[PDB]
Symmetry: C3
Subunit: 157 residues, 3 copies
């Protein structure tokens, strides 16, 4: 048996950069108002994998309430989310991540994101796709007011 | 094999509360404008299941011609879409639903939404993920102009 | 066993039409602005196919850098991507494509899109599903500033 999951995340710009996307530090004018590192790509991926497990969302495992993972970075959370998902007997099929930002340009840093995620998930990189796209200057991303990320995932049994 | 489907729906706030999400009446300042009951979560789920089965979308199972379902609430539609989907010999894999609203708060109502979808698709609650997230005041969701919802689904032959 | 992919595309209105969506020339008041033919439906799908394959995206296979695919249309890019995907030993499971447009009406032209896609992907039409929906006047789509599209794909190993 196999399982579909889906992740969505948005953070607005604010403060001073740089920014944290897919574990990778990316140089940029502004930063991201967030309850943690605000790694939008990792959050969505995390929500997507938990969704395939039906373990709800990251908000559910890691409330601002629990003191246990309070102040953890996105890479930490993804590792713990994953271990819990694995506890349910699941393993990785594959994952696809879609970054939506007018700027900065992601491509230089994408190869590094995919390496970062594959370690955190202990899979081949063949199982990790990341990509970036614009909304051609339309919407809140277009006006450069924020970054958005979707992600999909397939878990196995 | 298994079949993927995707669903996306939006409604604007307008008129008087309450709003109906995943079959659950959620008190709110305004309500959702729709020819239907405005249940974006179920409309999106229904389209994902229909899409997985290659059956079009709601507009194609329920055209302004067919009087049978004029004014029928979103759960009745979901079950008929399910009937027609089953009739092709598909069973449910799992589903994942992401409600995108700045407000109201969805968390206490999600367990019930998950309950109703389970019934309506005759499955374990284990097969059904519902999550909620915001766009941090950005876009039309952020400014409180409406609610969106994304859904993915996996069918089995 | 199987592999999920996801693709998202957006183009803006400018210039004369018609627009080309899913390979289909649809008459409309304005056209889409793009380096390409503007086909967000074939692009988003292409990206979903390449994401399933961990083959990257369109920006990676056919960059703006390389003037070799100057004048290439979305279907040509689609069949090329698919060739490369098949060469890595993948077949098609199914695809689901969701057009997000306030206007024009996509219904008359949808069945044809499916034909073009299935022939391009060398599959049965029952493996292709395409639907259309509005944002109910909300957002950049809602105000008629552009057309978004979102696609999911499932490949077979
Ligand atoms: C946040 C969402 C729903 C993302 C998915 C892409 C989409 C269709 C956005 C529309 O909102 P918008 O960004 O156009 O809002 P606006 O231009 O009104 O601020
Ligand atoms: N409309 C919303 N209702 C919620 O309950 N939430 C909760 O907030 C947490 C963090 O965003 C989410 O995990 C959800 O539990 C989010 C929403 F956007
Ligand atoms: N923020 C972005 N960063 C990128 O590197 N890109 C690259 O440009 C190509 C065309 O959109 C993309 O495929 C990606 O390689 C796009 C973005 F929107
Ligand atoms: N741009 C659109 N074109 C359509 O044909 N449609 C049709 O309208 C029905 C109701 O949204 C849909 O089912 C689709 O058939 C929707 C769109 F948003
Ligand atoms: Zn976040
Ligand atoms: Zn609706
Ligand atoms: Zn494009």
């Amino acid at each position: 048996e196999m399982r579909i999951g889906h992740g969505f995340d948005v953070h607005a710009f604010g403060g001073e950069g740089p920014i944290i996307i897919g574990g990778v530090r990316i140089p940029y004018e502004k930063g991201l108002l967030a309850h943690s590192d605000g790694d939008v790509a990792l959050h969505a991926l995390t929500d997507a994998l938990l969704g395939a497990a039906a373990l709800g969302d990251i908000g559910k495992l890691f409330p601002d309430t629990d003191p246990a993972f309070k102040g953890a970075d996105s890479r930490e959370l993804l590792r713990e989310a994953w271990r819990r998902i694995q506890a349910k007997g699941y393993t990785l099929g594959n994952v696809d991540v879609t970054i939506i930002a007018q700027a900065p340009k992601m491509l230089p840093h994408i190869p590094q994101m995919r390496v970062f995620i594959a370690e955190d998930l202990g899979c081949h990189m063949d199982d990790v796709n990341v990509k970036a796209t614009t909304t051609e200057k339309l919407g809140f991303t277009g006006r450069g007011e924020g970054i958005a990320c979707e992600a999909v995932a397939l878990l196995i049994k």
